[PDB]
Amino acid sequence: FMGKVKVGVNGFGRIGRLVTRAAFNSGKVDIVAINDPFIDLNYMVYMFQYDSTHGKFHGTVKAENGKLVINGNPITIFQERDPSKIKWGDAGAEYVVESTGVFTTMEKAGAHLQGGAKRVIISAPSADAPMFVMGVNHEKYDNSLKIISNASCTTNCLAPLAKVIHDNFGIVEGLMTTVHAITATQKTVDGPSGKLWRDGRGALQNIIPASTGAAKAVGKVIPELNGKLTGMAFRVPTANVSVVDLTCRLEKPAKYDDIKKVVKQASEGPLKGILGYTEHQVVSSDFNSDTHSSTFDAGAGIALNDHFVKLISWYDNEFGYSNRVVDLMAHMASKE
Amino acid sequence: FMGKVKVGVNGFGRIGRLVTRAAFNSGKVDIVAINDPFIDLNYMVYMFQYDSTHGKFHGTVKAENGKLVINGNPITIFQERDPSKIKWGDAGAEYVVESTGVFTTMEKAGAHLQGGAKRVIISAPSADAPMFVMGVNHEKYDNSLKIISNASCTTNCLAPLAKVIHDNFGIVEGLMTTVHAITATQKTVDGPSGKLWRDGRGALQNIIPASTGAAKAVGKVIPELNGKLTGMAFRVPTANVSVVDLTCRLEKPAKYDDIKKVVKQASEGPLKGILGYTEHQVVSSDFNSDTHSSTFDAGAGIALNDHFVKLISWYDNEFGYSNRVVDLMAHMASKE
Amino acid sequence: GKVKVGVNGFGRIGRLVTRAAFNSGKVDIVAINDPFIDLNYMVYMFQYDSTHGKFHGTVKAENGKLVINGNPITIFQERDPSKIKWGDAGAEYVVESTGVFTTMEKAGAHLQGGAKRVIISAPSADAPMFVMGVNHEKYDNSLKIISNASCTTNCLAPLAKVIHDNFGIVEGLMTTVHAITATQKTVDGPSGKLWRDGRGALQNIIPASTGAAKAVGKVIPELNGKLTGMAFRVPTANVSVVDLTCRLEKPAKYDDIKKVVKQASEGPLKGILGYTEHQVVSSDFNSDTHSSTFDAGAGIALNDHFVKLISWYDNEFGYSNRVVDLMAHMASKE
Amino acid sequence: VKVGVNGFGRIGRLVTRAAFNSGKVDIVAINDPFIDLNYMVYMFQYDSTHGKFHGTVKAENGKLVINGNPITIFQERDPSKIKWGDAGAEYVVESTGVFTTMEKAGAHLQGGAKRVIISAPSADAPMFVMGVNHEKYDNSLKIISNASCTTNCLAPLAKVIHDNFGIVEGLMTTVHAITATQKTVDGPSGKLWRDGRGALQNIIPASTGAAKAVGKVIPELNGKLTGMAFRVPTANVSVVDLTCRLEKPAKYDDIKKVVKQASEGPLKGILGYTEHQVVSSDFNSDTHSSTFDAGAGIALNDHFVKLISWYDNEFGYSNRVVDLMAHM
């Protein structure tokens, strides 16, 4: 019988590290193994302990006996580029968080099964793995699914809000912009990005338009919205915290105060901890290290009429998403 | 400067300096006087000569015999706090650019007529002065209008694009976001902004939502769109160049390729130099010092369907607007 | 038994002195004056902080007072500091943190409304200046108006003390690479007395003058005339670093310098002077309450007499906590 | 005349841009194997820091055409077989960031012609700094280095100060704009942990051999200078902060006179001089190696001074690589 699932992390990056932080903070899962061939054990101690965005780790972290020891818990450290060679089973890792960014198809992520992992959670959208958003469709998970995706940061922001708006008023169609903090895939100054020329341009100097499937992906976790949403992104030079800007047409008329009422109600009830709601005069830094997937900004949005509205929701793209990865794994464990 | 209208500039803040720069760069009007009671002549030289965003003035600027001398042309310097006392007429200034931002009503901007100026152009939105956007409604200007407004940079970006879309396909309704470079009204660190609390939060650290009437104001220069457009802004920590994000529903169906064709057509014909068009992989810095009001980014926009699109347009909020102020004065001069 | 304190100016330092007071409990804030921040706005500016995060505690407006952690605070809205009724509010000490009343004559305006002592949260042309850990025991009850110097002097002087005590400083030249502050501008703007300081702070490295190094010769008299320096403002929102190049009287290997700084940080300068060998960057000191943290790995010695020493400071949080510390120690001497 | 460029990064493109902008030399080849010819046009045409290229750039049946000049590209992974000879590449600029040693950089006459210039400090190639030791290059040396941007800023200033007052000792700090080796967010930099931390968020201390390297191009200063750097989140333009003890007493005004004199005479266009109230962006696209900021410096006394000099770490160096090839 499954109790508290043991977890391996592939890719000790922003998400790999903050998933580990979130697992130790929430206690919902146990981290027992980490693989990253570009960060050795002594370096992992440093990268985990000090964090420019979220501050120093509250807890203890050290290297001892070849293990990474976090709050007294030893963690097996692997250094493999090929995920099919990681001995997850030997280390007792049952679920693997696939957070490298480079193994996002079921075929590539399934490599972890060869080393004895039982299931894999891709920390990003997948071309073919079933995608889940906590609070929207995670109850559709079942234990026949050994390889799944937790979607994107942006889909985890848009989808809980889209669900409340659609449930209550009906979304005829919607177009989304996300203004998004810089990330590790960008460049400090103009450099090579042969697939995506705009993404090579210097991230500190530029507003950079970018494509994203996050809005269309909401139609996969909310099938009634299939084909009804799409969108794009602007990358801007802030270190963390991003925002969704949803322009949608509604089937039923909705005064903005009615939109506020149902979003606040959902934030206090069935979407508590997932969807937040504020009326305060907030800015992006007010959501740094905020664990919600989506926080509706009542004062920032604007209605043209009862059927055509612009809705604003904030997300700490690092911290909210990392906590959802842990939440999703604990839910999967409960369904074994 | 043969046959060019002679201009006085009230205020040598960033708009007044950039209008002055545009006048001498284009040759279209003759700056003959500048008023500013809070900036002495030696400081004017420094502020005009060095510019962090657009670089050193391409020309000569020096103080000589109590006048500011740009490219060899001497400019009379006034230091009057009471605009009704500036002796524009004695200096030969026929049109006055009212750029201080604190005399934007007709009652206050009209003070320049007392000192002998003949017309006043307010380089900002006005509560009561008729507003104009070059390329959109500037032919509605007539010689009875002694005090007018050139609207805002953002209105000057949206309105040319909205004109083309509405003219060809009909805009049923539209909602606009502008992702806006930082401005002088913002704060370096969290500070007081008693009327607009979010605007007081540190500009370098934050994405900051802000209200704007720029989209609604398009209903003034395009009367058929009255009540059909509104929007909001996100201020982000970039030094210059902003972007308009227009989500609109169209009356007639329009393939994205058809939108591109008619925008490109306008950019090469009657809106040449006002509305630009590109398909290149551009980012914000590529429009630094670009004098268009509005440059449509073909690749960055996205359509959900034939009646519902998101259109993207760049503007150097500083250089485009300042050149339009000069262009507007040149048009006024052509009527007398 | 804690001294009751009034704060004039509810800015970065006014608010963070208030935060430090309630967090440490060392003094009791009972009054705040700021004619540009009304009570409801005070709740917001104190609650939310882009740099140091949301306040850990409660803050609300109730019965016309600002209530922090259940403690009501009288709110004044006076432009003229001589008109603030500190005595009626029970404020015994006043933190003068507006930046515009830094002489003894101007800061003494608070005595007219009943304050007993004033602590200027800035350098003063004439008020005696104190740096915790360096010369604060030289304070005495006859001093009604004093200065806690600058953030930079509070970083440099504890380090300069250790180096001078142990090896002697013949002469030194200091650069501080300093985070942006409220006096700077977001884009090129008017600053008619200091032209460089009007240039846009997000885009530029900006050279600036500072009396901070010269002022160390006032809190450490043996160093009078032996230090000066300057600043570069750079576009980070908080945390700054001192870069002291000095000639030593007696020779010291760099490991000797590390030993005596580490010892000082663990003993007499604990909580004031920190010491690290970690691979730190400025973000690692955000909300760090030290006045000065020596970065052993970052400095470099040319020889046993000529060294460059690096020390970090959270210019907001270290200094604000020192203001509270200084008042606590003043109160213990009443 | 006639030059090829290995690599098309910030230094490769700006050398290429400085070549056509100055006309001192003719670019006739480019390599960089990780960017196709179409991408080359875009990267050279648009530049976030320095603006769009003042000219024309297209592709015409192969060949990158800049202002009407074909260039020919090779896209080869290792330098040993690039075929610079049949292209006309009389010189080659390294620019790749690797191949800074004389053995690894040597693989350029194996299929090429004549001389090779390394756009970085070299472990063992002879280094040169225009205006300081460039009049001591000779035709025997076919694998040379142009030092670094920072050495090119410090050395001209150090030469003038040393020639006139003698530098007993000096310690240097560079406050340096962000570079391509830094990271947008906290990421891996296994040999240099501080450099992995988020470049937008942080002042980052860093080691640099630039001040020690000055003792190599100015031998009388060997062992008399060292220093360090702080990386800060600005996009371009850096500044040198030199604190030094002088043998001969010097009023600051006398320091100003000899630096201004040098800037107008033998070091013109290499060492600049200003008393204006400048900030870093005032030097974007400035082609000087080093511009002395008179008002920013400070003296404690006649023998102990802090001297401040600005440099566009991209543009000044790139034009020195071109000026060095001009002097051969």
Ligand SMILES: NC(=O)c1ccc[n+]([C@@H]2O[C@H](COP(=O)([O-])OP(=O)(O)OC[C@H]3O[C@@H](n4cnc5c(N)ncnc54)[C@H](O)[C@@H]3O)[C@@H](O)[C@H]2O)c1
């Ligand atoms: N940063 C965010 O806001 C965010 C939010 C949600 C999802 N994601 C997604 O999560 C994934 C990780 O993003 P991130 O921001 O943490 O990136 P990151 O670059 O910070 O982390 C990636 C890590 O993977 C490591 N790695 C690279 N190759 C590897 C291999 N072969 N085996 C093991 N480890 C390897 C790298 O060393 C790095 O530490 C991406 O798919 C991203 O799209 C990111």
Ligand SMILES: NC(=O)c1ccc[n+]([C@@H]2O[C@H](COP(=O)([O-])OP(=O)(O)OC[C@H]3O[C@@H](n4cnc5c(N)ncnc54)[C@H](O)[C@@H]3O)[C@@H](O)[C@H]2O)c1
């Ligand atoms: N920010 C730092 O790092 C730091 C560190 C140490 C010392 N200091 C010094 O502390 C002082 C305050 O600096 P700050 O950064 O908090 O500046 P700030 O601008 O953030 O705070 C100043 C506050 O004073 C208020 N104020 C202005 N005039 C007033 C008046 N007549 N009466 C009452 N209040 C008034 C303003 O509303 C503002 O809120 C300055 O002298 C500064 O040099 C600053």
Ligand SMILES: *C[C@]1(O)CC[C@H](C(C)C)[C@H]2C=C(C(=O)O)COC(=O)[C@@H]21
């Ligand atoms: C969250 C992020 O890592 C960063 C932003 C990115 C878009 C919105 C620019 C997100 C969307 C993804 C996608 O649409 O495929 C990738 O996965 C993510 O989580 C990213």
Ligand SMILES: *C[C@]1(O)CC[C@H](C(C)C)[C@H]2C=C(C(=O)O)COC(=O)[C@@H]21
């Ligand atoms: C701490 C600060 O408010 C900000 C930086 C400033 C200098 C270093 C640029 C400090 C120095 C002062 C001085 O000693 O002259 C002024 O007061 C300060 O506290 C400031």
Ligand SMILES: [Zn+2]
């Ligand atoms: Zn913390």
Ligand SMILES: [Zn+2]
């Ligand atoms: Zn929350």
Ligand SMILES: [Zn+2]
């Ligand atoms: Zn244009």
Ligand SMILES: [Zn+2]
């Ligand atoms: Zn006429």
Ligand SMILES: [Zn+2]
């Ligand atoms: Zn500390």
